[PDB]
Amino acid sequence: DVQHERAYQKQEGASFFNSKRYWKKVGLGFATPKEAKEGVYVDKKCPFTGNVSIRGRILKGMVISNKMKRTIIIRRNYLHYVKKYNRFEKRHKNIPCHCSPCFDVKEGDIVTVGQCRPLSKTVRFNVLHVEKHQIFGSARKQFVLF
Template sequence: MTRNIGIKVKAPKEEPKEGDKKNPFNGTLPVRGKLFEGKVVKSRGKDTVVLQKEANVYFSKFKRYGRSTSRIHAHVPSNLQVNEGDTVIAAECRPIAKSVSFVVVEVKE
Protein backbone atom coordinates (compact mmCIF):
# COMPACT_ATOMS: atom_id res chain seq x y z
CA MET A 1 0.00 0.00 0.00
CA THR A 2 1.34 3.39 -0.98
CA ARG A 3 0.66 6.46 1.13
CA ASN A 4 0.26 10.05 -0.07
CA ILE A 5 3.42 12.07 0.65
CA GLY A 6 1.88 15.46 -0.23
CA ILE A 7 3.91 16.01 -3.42
CA LYS A 8 2.62 15.38 -6.95
CA VAL A 9 5.06 12.69 -8.04
CA LYS A 10 4.59 9.25 -9.53
CA ALA A 11 4.58 6.54 -6.89
CA PRO A 12 7.03 3.70 -7.55
CA LYS A 13 5.50 0.49 -8.88
CA GLU A 14 8.06 -1.88 -7.34
CA GLU A 15 7.51 -3.32 -3.89
CA PRO A 16 10.00 -2.16 -1.21
CA LYS A 17 12.20 -4.49 0.81
CA GLU A 18 10.71 -5.81 4.01
CA GLY A 19 11.16 -3.41 6.95
CA ASP A 20 12.28 -0.36 4.92
CA LYS A 21 11.39 2.45 7.36
CA LYS A 22 13.33 5.11 5.43
CA ASN A 23 10.84 5.06 2.56
CA PRO A 24 8.43 8.01 2.16
CA PHE A 25 5.88 5.96 0.17
CA ASN A 26 5.74 2.75 2.21
CA GLY A 27 7.66 3.51 5.41
CA THR A 28 7.40 6.16 8.11
CA LEU A 29 9.76 8.84 6.72
CA PRO A 30 8.00 12.25 6.58
CA VAL A 31 8.77 14.63 3.71
CA ARG A 32 8.88 18.39 4.32
CA GLY A 33 10.56 21.57 3.15
CA LYS A 34 12.49 22.01 -0.07
CA LEU A 35 12.47 20.09 -3.33
CA PHE A 36 15.75 19.63 -5.18
CA GLU A 37 16.03 18.60 -8.83
CA GLY A 38 19.44 17.49 -9.97
CA LYS A 39 21.59 15.02 -11.82
CA VAL A 40 23.06 11.96 -10.11
CA VAL A 41 26.84 12.35 -10.03
CA LYS A 42 27.80 9.40 -7.78
CA SER A 43 25.88 6.32 -6.76
CA ARG A 44 28.59 4.22 -5.15
CA GLY A 45 27.38 4.37 -1.56
CA LYS A 46 24.85 1.98 -0.08
CA ASP A 47 21.36 3.48 -0.62
CA THR A 48 22.87 6.97 -1.06
CA VAL A 49 23.54 9.13 -4.12
CA VAL A 50 25.19 12.51 -4.69
CA LEU A 51 23.09 15.00 -6.67
CA GLN A 52 24.40 18.09 -8.43
CA LYS A 53 22.28 21.13 -9.28
CA GLU A 54 23.46 23.79 -11.71
CA ALA A 55 22.11 27.33 -11.66
CA ASN A 56 22.88 30.65 -13.29
CA VAL A 57 23.92 33.45 -10.93
CA TYR A 58 23.77 37.10 -11.97
CA PHE A 59 26.69 39.35 -10.97
CA SER A 60 25.36 42.91 -11.06
CA LYS A 61 28.82 44.47 -10.77
CA PHE A 62 29.95 42.85 -14.02
CA LYS A 63 26.48 42.63 -15.65
CA ARG A 64 27.16 39.00 -16.50
CA TYR A 65 25.91 35.56 -15.56
CA GLY A 66 28.07 32.90 -14.00
CA ARG A 67 27.54 29.23 -13.35
CA SER A 68 27.01 27.88 -9.87
CA THR A 69 26.82 24.25 -8.76
CA SER A 70 25.77 22.71 -5.48
CA ARG A 71 25.86 19.09 -4.33
CA ILE A 72 23.73 17.23 -1.84
CA HIS A 73 23.58 13.66 -0.56
CA ALA A 74 20.23 11.90 -0.84
CA HIS A 75 18.85 8.56 0.36
CA VAL A 76 17.43 6.19 -2.27
CA PRO A 77 14.43 4.08 -1.15
CA SER A 78 14.62 0.35 -1.84
CA ASN A 79 11.88 0.45 -4.50
CA LEU A 80 13.61 3.02 -6.78
CA GLN A 81 16.42 2.21 -9.21
CA VAL A 82 18.83 5.16 -9.66
CA ASN A 83 21.97 5.15 -11.82
CA GLU A 84 24.65 7.74 -12.50
CA GLY A 85 23.48 10.32 -15.05
CA ASP A 86 19.77 10.11 -14.12
CA THR A 87 17.80 13.26 -13.36
CA VAL A 88 15.87 12.92 -10.11
CA ILE A 89 13.73 14.92 -7.70
CA ALA A 90 14.73 14.84 -4.04
CA ALA A 91 12.64 16.11 -1.13
CA GLU A 92 13.86 17.31 2.25
CA CYS A 93 13.29 15.02 5.22
CA ARG A 94 14.61 14.52 8.74
CA PRO A 95 18.35 13.86 9.02
CA ILE A 96 19.03 10.24 8.09
CA ALA A 97 22.81 10.44 8.52
CA LYS A 98 25.41 13.11 9.21
CA SER A 99 25.27 14.51 5.66
CA VAL A 100 21.98 13.04 4.35
CA SER A 101 18.82 15.12 4.79
CA PHE A 102 17.10 14.49 1.45
CA VAL A 103 15.32 11.47 -0.04
CA VAL A 104 14.80 10.69 -3.74
CA VAL A 105 11.08 10.68 -4.56
CA GLU A 106 11.02 10.45 -8.36
CA VAL A 107 13.30 9.48 -11.24
CA LYS A 108 12.67 11.69 -14.30
CA GLU A 109 12.53 9.89 -17.62
Protein backbone atom coordinates in the same frame (compact mmCIF):
# COMPACT_ATOMS: atom_id res chain seq x y z
CA ASP B 1 16.38 -13.18 1.36
CA VAL B 2 14.83 -9.80 2.12
CA GLN B 3 17.04 -9.04 5.14
CA HIS B 4 20.78 -9.71 5.31
CA GLU B 5 22.10 -7.60 8.21
CA ARG B 6 22.87 -8.52 11.83
CA ALA B 7 19.35 -7.51 12.88
CA TYR B 8 15.76 -7.80 11.64
CA GLN B 9 13.56 -5.32 9.78
CA LYS B 10 9.93 -5.15 10.85
CA GLN B 11 8.31 -2.38 8.73
CA GLU B 12 6.74 -0.58 11.67
CA GLY B 13 3.24 0.82 11.27
CA ALA B 14 2.20 -1.74 8.65
CA SER B 15 0.09 -4.29 10.60
CA PHE B 16 0.75 -7.98 10.05
CA PHE B 17 -2.14 -10.40 10.51
CA ASN B 18 -5.50 -8.67 11.08
CA SER B 19 -5.87 -6.44 7.97
CA LYS B 20 -9.56 -6.71 6.97
CA ARG B 21 3.81 -4.39 3.40
CA TYR B 22 2.77 -0.75 3.83
CA TRP B 23 2.79 2.21 1.45
CA LYS B 24 2.15 5.95 1.56
CA LYS B 25 1.47 8.50 -1.18
CA VAL B 26 3.21 11.43 0.62
CA GLY B 27 1.00 13.90 -1.24
CA LEU B 28 2.54 16.79 -3.21
CA GLY B 29 0.72 15.65 -6.34
CA PHE B 30 2.70 12.41 -6.54
CA ALA B 31 1.76 8.73 -6.87
CA THR B 32 3.84 5.90 -5.46
CA PRO B 33 5.45 3.57 -8.03
CA LYS B 34 4.21 0.04 -8.57
CA GLU B 35 7.73 -0.96 -7.52
CA ALA B 36 7.12 0.38 -4.01
CA LYS B 37 3.54 -0.93 -4.12
CA GLU B 38 4.35 -4.60 -4.77
CA GLY B 39 8.02 -4.81 -3.80
CA VAL B 40 9.73 -6.79 -1.05
CA TYR B 41 12.14 -4.11 0.17
CA VAL B 42 12.07 -2.86 3.77
CA ASP B 43 13.46 0.54 4.76
CA LYS B 44 12.82 2.65 7.85
CA LYS B 45 13.81 5.86 6.03
CA CYS B 46 11.92 5.51 2.74
CA PRO B 47 9.34 8.27 2.14
CA PHE B 48 6.88 5.66 0.84
CA THR B 49 7.67 3.00 3.46
CA GLY B 50 9.56 4.44 6.44
CA ASN B 51 8.82 6.95 9.19
CA VAL B 52 10.12 10.01 7.32
CA SER B 53 7.65 12.80 6.53
CA ILE B 54 8.28 14.91 3.42
CA ARG B 55 8.10 18.62 4.22
CA GLY B 56 10.13 21.70 3.35
CA ARG B 57 11.78 22.24 -0.03
CA ILE B 58 11.37 20.21 -3.22
CA LEU B 59 14.29 20.23 -5.66
CA LYS B 60 15.28 18.72 -9.00
CA GLY B 61 18.80 17.41 -9.28
CA MET B 62 21.51 15.63 -11.21
CA VAL B 63 22.64 12.26 -9.83
CA ILE B 64 26.41 11.95 -9.41
CA SER B 65 27.29 8.57 -7.87
CA ASN B 66 25.22 5.40 -7.54
CA LYS B 67 27.82 2.84 -6.39
CA MET B 68 27.21 4.27 -2.92
CA LYS B 69 24.76 2.04 -1.06
CA ARG B 70 21.16 3.27 -0.72
CA THR B 71 22.32 6.88 -1.11
CA ILE B 72 23.18 9.11 -4.06
CA ILE B 73 24.81 12.49 -4.64
CA ILE B 74 22.68 15.19 -6.28
CA ARG B 75 24.30 18.03 -8.21
CA ARG B 76 22.36 21.24 -8.84
CA ASN B 77 23.89 23.52 -11.46
CA TYR B 78 22.83 27.16 -11.70
CA LEU B 79 24.07 30.56 -12.82
CA HIS B 80 25.13 33.11 -10.21
CA TYR B 81 24.45 36.65 -11.38
CA VAL B 82 27.34 39.01 -10.60
CA LYS B 83 26.07 42.53 -10.00
CA LYS B 84 29.39 44.20 -10.81
CA TYR B 85 29.76 42.58 -14.24
CA ASN B 86 26.05 42.10 -15.08
CA ARG B 87 26.92 38.54 -16.10
CA PHE B 88 26.14 35.03 -14.93
CA GLU B 89 28.61 32.50 -13.56
CA LYS B 90 28.57 28.71 -13.47
CA ARG B 91 28.47 27.55 -9.85
CA HIS B 92 27.18 24.40 -8.21
CA LYS B 93 27.17 22.24 -5.14
CA ASN B 94 26.19 18.62 -4.61
CA ILE B 95 23.77 17.52 -1.89
CA PRO B 96 23.54 13.88 -0.71
CA CYS B 97 20.04 12.40 -0.68
CA HIS B 98 18.73 9.02 0.44
CA CYS B 99 17.53 6.86 -2.46
CA SER B 100 14.93 4.20 -1.75
CA PRO B 101 15.61 0.66 -3.06
CA CYS B 102 12.25 0.92 -4.87
CA PHE B 103 13.95 2.87 -7.69
CA ASP B 104 16.40 2.11 -10.49
CA VAL B 105 19.04 4.84 -10.80
CA LYS B 106 21.94 5.28 -13.22
CA GLU B 107 24.74 7.83 -13.45
CA GLY B 108 23.27 10.56 -15.67
CA ASP B 109 19.53 10.69 -14.84
CA ILE B 110 17.54 13.56 -13.34
CA VAL B 111 15.94 12.87 -9.96
CA THR B 112 13.23 14.78 -8.13
CA VAL B 113 14.07 15.15 -4.44
CA GLY B 114 12.10 16.28 -1.40
CA GLN B 115 13.08 17.48 2.06
CA CYS B 116 12.74 15.22 5.10
CA ARG B 117 13.84 15.32 8.72
CA PRO B 118 17.60 15.06 9.34
CA LEU B 119 18.36 11.50 8.22
CA SER B 120 22.15 11.63 8.46
CA LYS B 121 24.23 14.60 9.62
CA THR B 122 24.45 15.83 6.02
CA VAL B 123 21.76 13.68 4.34
CA ARG B 124 18.28 15.14 4.81
CA PHE B 125 16.75 14.65 1.36
CA ASN B 126 14.87 11.79 -0.31
CA VAL B 127 14.22 10.76 -3.91
CA LEU B 128 10.70 10.55 -5.33
CA HIS B 129 11.15 10.21 -9.09
CA VAL B 130 13.71 8.94 -11.58
CA GLU B 131 13.70 10.60 -15.00
CA LYS B 132 15.69 8.48 -17.44
CA HIS B 133 18.48 10.51 -19.02
CA GLN B 134 21.42 8.68 -20.58
CA ILE B 135 24.75 10.53 -20.67
CA PHE B 136 28.18 10.32 -22.30
CA GLY B 137 31.54 11.15 -20.72
CA SER B 138 31.82 11.97 -17.02
CA ALA B 139 28.62 12.99 -15.23
CA ARG B 140 30.51 15.79 -13.46
CA LYS B 141 31.03 17.97 -16.54
CA GLN B 142 27.60 18.30 -18.18
CA PHE B 143 25.72 21.44 -17.18
CA VAL B 144 21.93 21.47 -16.78
CA LEU B 145 20.01 24.66 -16.00
CA PHE B 146 17.98 22.82 -13.34
